[PDB]
Structures are given as C-alpha cells and as structure tokens.
Write a protein that binds this ligand. Structure first.
Ligand code: HEM
Ligand code: HEM
Ligand SMILES: C[C@H](O)[C@H](O)[C@H]1CNc2nc(N)[nH]c(=O)c2N1
Ligand SMILES: C[C@H](O)[C@H](O)[C@H]1CNc2nc(N)[nH]c(=O)c2N1
Ligand SMILES: CNCCCc1cc(C)cc(N)n1
Ligand SMILES: CNCCCc1cc(C)cc(N)n1
Ligand SMILES: [Zn+2]
Lengths: 414, 420
C-alpha cells in the first residue's frame, strides 16, 4: 500500500510507504480528526518489553546492513536474557546514539530535522545524584553554546526502572526566565513560568524579582526530592534585542537567551523510557519574536511596540498588531545575527524542511510531519510548507510528553 | 467513547463534543495516520457512482427527512410519516425524489453550518436561497446567476446567497458552472514563458478562448461564464459589467500604491462545489458571501503561483531583498493587506479582517457547543494564512468530522464531459 502527498504550489507528488511501520495511536479515529489537539489522550511488564526491544534491535541491525547477522542474533539473545533475569535491559552506546538521533528524526512536530544526523549524544546513564545531573547539564550547556556557534546536543540520564526512582529535570527548558505575579494582578517577567517560579521560591530560591531572571535548575535523581542549582552565569549566553532602523527599540530593555533546550520530555527507545533527556538546538526566530514576545499569555509587547511605532491602535483592520509583530521579529533576527549567535528565520527553516522532507521520502519512504506545528506562527502561506500536504504518524524511537513532576512526585523531607 | 473535550490554551475554556457521534463518513484519518493536512483525504461517498438502486437512495432520504422533522419538533407526526411514504413512491417510480422548498432551504443552510473549513459560519442561518430547480437551459442559468450576483452584491452591502439548479439524475445530464467562481480574472500564458493575469486560471481561460471567447489580454479581465445545462455542451456568457463590483486598491499612507494599478472584485462566489442533501446531489449551486481580507491580500496577491506581487511592493517600499531574514516578504505582506482592507472599507464594500473573523468564529464555536453539542472545524483551514498566532483560533483546539447535508468537491467538468 502507498499514500500520496502533493505540494499544491509545485505539483510535486511524493509516495509514503513508511507509514506502514507505525504502531501507536495518532489520536484520530476513522470518523474524527484530532490533528489540532495538543495532547490527544507506570512501567512495562516483561511480556510487553520483549517485542518492543526486538522491534528496535531489528531496526538498528537493519539500519547498519547487519540484519540476520550472527551479531544481530546474539544481541537479540542477550537482550532477552536481561529482560528475563532483570525485567529490563541496557542499550549499548551505539544503540543509544542511534535511538536518540532517530527520536529526533521521528519528531513530527519539528521543522529543524534536516540536522537530525548531526546530534551530539552525551551518555549520562552512570549519574546517581542531582549534583551529578548539574555537572552533566553544565557540560551540555557549555558544549552546545560554543560561544554562539550553537551545536545540537542531548544528555541522557538513567532510564525508568520501577517508576519510583525516576530522574527528572523539573524545568521545562534548561534556560528560561522567571515570572512573578504582582498583588495588583500584573506579571513581572515571563507569565508562562509563574508556577515553576513559585516552586523554586518555595524550595529556597532567592529571586532577584526582575524581568529576565534566569531560573535555577531543579533536578531530581533516582526519585528523590529535587534540588536547586544556579547555572554559572558565564555559561548563559544572552542577546540584547535591538532594531536596525528603530533606535528606540533597545530602550524596551529586551533580551533573550541563545540556547533553546527542552528538558521536560521523555525519550522512548526499544520500550525503555528516559524520563530526563534534555536536548538543545538553535532558535527559529519566530519562537522568540512571535510566541515568546507576542503571545497574549507571554511577554505581550505588541502594545508597547505599536505605541512607539505610532500605529493607529483604534481599529483591528489597521493591522497594527500584524505590523508590530513583523518588526519585533526583524529585531530578534538582526540582534542574534549581529552578535553571531546561531538562529534561523522561518523562511530559511521551512525551505530546508521541504528539502529534508523530499530527501526522506526518497531514501526512507516518507517523513511524518505535523502541519499544525510545522507551519510557522506568522506569514504562514508565504512559506513553502503551507502548501505542502503532510502525513502524521508515530514512529519509534520517539520523544513523548510526560506529566509535570510536581503533579506526581510524593515528597520526603520533614 | 461518548464525549471529547477541546481546550483553548489562551483562555483555558474547555468544550465538550457529543455532536461528532452523528458523523456519517470517513475523515481519511485512522488510529495510526492523520490526514488532516491532505486537501482531499477521502473518497467515501454516501451514494455510489450514479443512479442508485432503491436500497441505496431511500435510507439516505429517510435519514435526512428524519433529521428535518426532528429539527422542527415533529418526528413521527402525520406530515413526517406521509413525507416518508411520498419519498418512497417517488423513488419507486422515478429512481429519485424532489425536496420541498422548506427542506431545500434547511438543507442549504445546514451544509453551510457543517462546512468545517469555513470561518464565516456564525452567519449560517442568514442565507438567501434561490430555487432554480425549474431551469432548463444555459440561458436560464445565466439569468439565475445574474439575479444572484445583483442580489448578493446589493451595491456593496453584500448579502449571502445560494442559487440551486436541478439535481443530478443519471450523471449524463448534469447542470454545471464550469467556472470555479462566478467572478475571476483571466490568466494568459505569455510567449516568453511568464503569465499575465491570474495564473490559477490559465487552463480555464484557455478553454474559454478555445470556446470562442475573445480575450482583451489584460491583467484584470473578468472571465465569461461557461454554463452547462442538462449535460449539454457549455455556453459562454458575458456578465454585464455593471453587475461586477470592483475595488481599486490604494494604501492609506503609500501614495504610490495606487500606481500599481491593482484592483479586485467584491463578490466571492464559489461555483464548483456539490451540495448533497438526503442522497441528492446538486452539482451546480453557486454560493456567495463576503471576503476576509487575507483571501485577497495574502493568497490571491502573494502566492507564488498566483499574482506574486510581493516583489513589486517590496521594491517600492525600499526594503532589503538580499536575504530572507530581513523579512521583506513579511513586511510587504502586511502593507498589502492593510491596503486591501482600507480600499474596501473606503468604498463601503463589505469585508472582514482576519482578527474580527476569527474572534467571531470562537464565539460561533461557543454558541454551537452550547446548543448543538459541537462544531466541526478544520484548524488547517480556519487559521488565517498570516499572523496565525496573534488570532484566537490558533490557540483553539478543534475536532473535525463530516456531517450531512454538506458541500463536497467534485471533478472539474472538462475532465469528464463527452462533447457533442
Ligand atoms: C537544530 C535546530 C532546531 C530547530 C531550528 C528546531 C525547531 C523547532 C521548532 C520551531 C519547533 C516547534 C516548537 C515550538 O513552537 O514550541 C520544534 C519542536 C520540536 N523539536 Fe526541534 N528544532 C531544532 C532541534 C531539535 C533537536 C536537536 C531535537 C531533539 C534532539 C528536537 C526535537 C523537537 C521536538 C521533540 C519538538 C516537539 C516539541 C513539542 O511538541 O513541544 N529539535 N523544533
Ligand atoms: C459570509 C461571509 C463568509 C466568509 C467571511 C467566509 C470565509 C471563508 C474562508 C476564509 C474560507 C477559506 C477558503 C479559502 O481560503 O479559499 C471559506 C471556505 C468555505 N466556505 Fe465560507 N465564508 C463566508 C460565507 C460562506 C457561505 C455563504 C457559504 C455557503 C453557503 C460558505 C461555505 C464555505 C465552504 C464550503 C468553504 C470550503 C470551500 C473550499 O474547500 O474550497 N461560506 N470561507
Ligand atoms: C497543504 C495545505 O493543506 C493546503 O495548502 C491548505 C492549507 N490551509 C489552507 N487554508 C485556507 N483557508 N485555504 C487554503 O487554500 C489552504 N490550503
Ligand atoms: C490548538 C493548537 O493545536 C495549538 O495552539 C498549537 C498550534 N500550532 C503550534 N505550532 C507550534 N510550532 N507551536 C505551538 O505551540 C503550537 N500550538
Ligand atoms: C516546546 N517548544 C519549545 C522549544 C522547542 C525547540 C527545541 C529545540 C531543540 C530547538 C528549538 N529551536 N526549539
Ligand atoms: C476556495 N474558496 C475560494 C473562496 C472561498 C469563499 C467563499 C465564500 C462564499 C466567501 C468567502 N469569503 N470565501
Ligand atoms: Zn487526523
């Protein structure tokens, strides 16, 4: 069986055979599409783990042209031994690297996947304490930041065992700014992080109470209560935002951090669950300029920018929001480029994704892709992905969402 | 199971959908694959190829009549049972049946109500329905369409309307409007290789010329109507220009913008879709409303395989066009959409910006969840093609499913018509 996808701007048609390899739910049914649901909705038994592990080992030995080899059969046998005796198993280094890259390659919501095979994998499965996690994460940040010449990386902590000894980074990203609700109902800093800021303050963090306080790391090892650590400031690269034409823009006092690093997701490889696996790349400009700065629930600077632009803010149909949004996004890109911090604009990024997508169809039989997430949050139809049909399905290895740790952790102190 | 929630991530409002339990045909998606960005994911239809047997048509007829009599707090009433028996005899003796005027109006309005790709549906029950089922010729079709266009245009105070020509019978006698919209501009393949006018319409424009249309060969030549009645060869008709309201595009600050010489028509009137009610297929059912500005200014003017005028606007704005990261395309894109909205509003032609339209749709969703238990919506199509996330629909989860009556796509008639 085959499925065709068409680009309505170029008329190119690609043929997806890879979707036959999926085996997890999309959330949709034959009569309902849930393609726009954010999350369409504790450990595997021995019998469940066996075929998951086999499927992965089979896929890895196939990836390296060794399917059916004596080394393939011996690995299968070895894995079955571990599951039988210990109810789990341990990946080889080569399998871990392969699995981490393919979770990225399989990430249907990610437009930056042309880069998937250039991922630096840091094996942290020997870590046992939150201090050790802090060390590993500092090394990751320093390596990935590379003085502005950003390099993709992931650090992988010990896999889940019984579910009572999970490793977790409680932060949603490694570097994010604090948010403080004020008595008058206003918000200082990032409104998205108000809740996590409260948790930190409660654990003993002394907040500077400013607009751009880098949050501390809150790190949990082996199921223990999480612990606070301050990332050394010299490892946090930041970019002050200015505009190439509006000299007043710098007077907004805006800045952002250079390294985007998701730390709250779960990496599944061969049925094993890596609940702490922070990974980092580099920014597409609209992530900061459209969402981070201009979401109503975020920094929400459209009004102030539009005021300084003297826009007619009485009618929506003046498109003052649209005009201000573009300029903010110009500033963001000009600022990172001036400081020689890696960043990609949404036009360049989506153009590379189409080339990546077509290469994937040729060499792999397809490329699962989430149009709802791939299309940038501004100027959608002037990017090539808008006109690109895409098929969404779930391949494993994969990155998965997981409950926030403060909703499931049971505390131990006092 | 028997309820699905959708969340708005800006407001945290959650809505609970039970209406999807009434969905009739396949979305194309499965457990394992989502086809939500496929233009035509499914060929699942309610009636086969053409002239159905009794056991194929009657169950669909009964379902629609049942739904209509339930809608008006009857069901099982005397008139409902007689209507069932009347449709039964009509199918028995003609292999089809005829809708009452009330059923036809109910069906048209509910096809619009069920149109998951339409952001305009808060207006769904305010639709003027012109019954053109007595039409027999392309000349009569022309007369019906002129009246529709004049009524709908209403000197700029646009009014939504649909004109419904006779239903399909055996599939060799279809009524068709060959135009994709009642009013579009021609597109001309130039000798060097470029394209003059609207590149979307090059094929249709060439069919028209091949049918004896004499093209003025300009950038905004209103195409003729190409009308097909009762399966005969289609015939060309020129819409009287006084019925075709147009808006010259100017900009409220760039005085040079008018010198671009751009304009657009006021009336968007889709004429290539198929209206399905109770198993009956109306292959010619032109419907019109009024524009959301982005439809002209983002897609019509700025798509690559359309008018592609970002280039010119950008030069005149003196933007840096060396690299993409200057966002010169984004910047010109905004100015063009400002001009369009300013131009329509200045001439008092109905138009809605994408901020107002998406706000109305969120309110329409809330209304529909409250009274109907759900609202089918296609996020891929509802979210505007610019500034997506500063509109409220971007942050609104939506469920998509296929309710009947409905508007369906159908093949372009020149791929299927056997000429005489
Ligand atoms: C290298 C440059 C990269 C770029 C430009 C990029 C870009 C993006 C963008 C724009 C999104 C949408 C995120 C949002 O709007 O919140 C995204 C999502 C995602 N990316 Fe990439 N990314 C990059 C690297 C990576 C790497 C290295 C990984 C994993 C090793 C990764 C995995 C993911 C995943 C799992 C998501 C989905 C996150 C979610 O659903 O919340 N990406 N990426
Ligand atoms: C009254 C104001 C209306 C507005 C502002 C509006 C807006 C829109 C927009 C922006 C689209 C996306 C189409 C595109 O981007 O090409 C659309 C699609 C659609 N609308 Fe509405 N619409 C209106 C009236 C109507 C009416 C009166 C009907 C039917 C009686 C209708 C039925 C549909 C259908 C069936 C589609 C899908 C068409 C397709 O897939 O090509 N709309 N509408
Ligand atoms: C591939 C993609 O589905 C296709 O280009 C769609 C996307 N969303 C759209 N949305 C609207 N309103 N109009 C369109 O033509 C499209 N095109
Ligand atoms: C409701 C909707 O699914 C939600 O707002 C999505 C839409 N598309 C997105 N696309 C990206 N890249 N990031 C997002 O957070 C979202 N949010
Ligand atoms: C959930 N989205 C937040 C940030 C997503 C992301 C991740 C990565 C690795 C790079 C990037 N540019 N963006
Ligand atoms: C492919 N759709 C083109 C036109 C869509 C449309 C239809 C109607 C009735 C109104 C509107 N504002 N837009
Ligand atoms: Zn789907």
């Amino acid at each position: 069986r085959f499925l065709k996808v068409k680009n309505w701007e170029t008329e190119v048609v690609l043929t997806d055979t890879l979707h036959l390899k999926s085996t997890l739910e999309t959330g949709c049914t034959e009569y309902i599409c849930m393609g726009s649901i954010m999350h369409p909705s504790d450990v595997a038994t021995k019998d469940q783990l066996f075929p998951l592990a086999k499927e992965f080992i089979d896929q890895y030995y196939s990836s390296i042209k060794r399917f059916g080899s004596k080394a393939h059969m011996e690995r299968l046998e070895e894995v079955n031994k571990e599951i039988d005796t210990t109810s789990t198993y341990q990946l080889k280094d080569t399998e871990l690297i392969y699995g981490a890259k393919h979770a990225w390659r399989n990430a249907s919501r990610c437009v930056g996947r042309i880069q998937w095979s250039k991922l630096q994998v840091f094996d942290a499965r020997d870590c046992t304490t939150a201090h050790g996690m802090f060390n590993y994460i500092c090394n990751h940040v320093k390596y990935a930041t590379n003085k502005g010449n950003l390099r993709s990386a992931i650090t992988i902590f010990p896999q889940r065992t019984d579910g009572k000894h999970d490793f977790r980074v409680w932060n949603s990203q490694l570097i994010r700014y604090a948010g403080y609700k004020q008595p008058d109902g206003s918000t200082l800093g990032d409104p998205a992080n108000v809740q996590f800021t409260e948790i930190c303050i409660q654990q003993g963090w002394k907040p500077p109470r400013g607009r751009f306080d880098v949050l501390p790391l809150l790190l949990q090892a082996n199921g223990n209560d999480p612990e606070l650590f301050q990332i050394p400031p010299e490892l946090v690269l930041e970019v002050p935002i200015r505009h190439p034409k509006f000299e007043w823009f710098k007077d907004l006092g805006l800045k952002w951090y250079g390294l985007p690093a998701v730390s709250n997701m779960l990496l599944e490889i061969g049925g094993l669950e890596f609940s702490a696996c922070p990974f980092s790349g580099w920014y597409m400009g609209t992530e900061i300029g459209v969402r981070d700065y201009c979401d109503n629930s975020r920094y929400n600077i459209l009004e102030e920018v539009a005021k300084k632009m003297n826009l007619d803010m009485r009618k929506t149909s003046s498109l003052w929001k649209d005009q201000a949004l573009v300029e903010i996004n110009i500033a963001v890109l000009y600022s990172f480029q001036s400081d020689k911090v890696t960043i990609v604009d949404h036009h360049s990024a989506t153009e590379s994704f189409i080339k990546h997508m077509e290469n994937e169809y040729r060499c792999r039989g397809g490329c699962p892709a989430d149009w709802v997430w791939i299309v940038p949050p501004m100027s959608g139809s002037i990017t090539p992905v808008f006109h690109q049909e895409m098929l969404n399905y779930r391949l494993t290895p994969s990155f998965e969402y997981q409950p926030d740790p403060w909703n499931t952790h049971v505390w131990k102190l006092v």
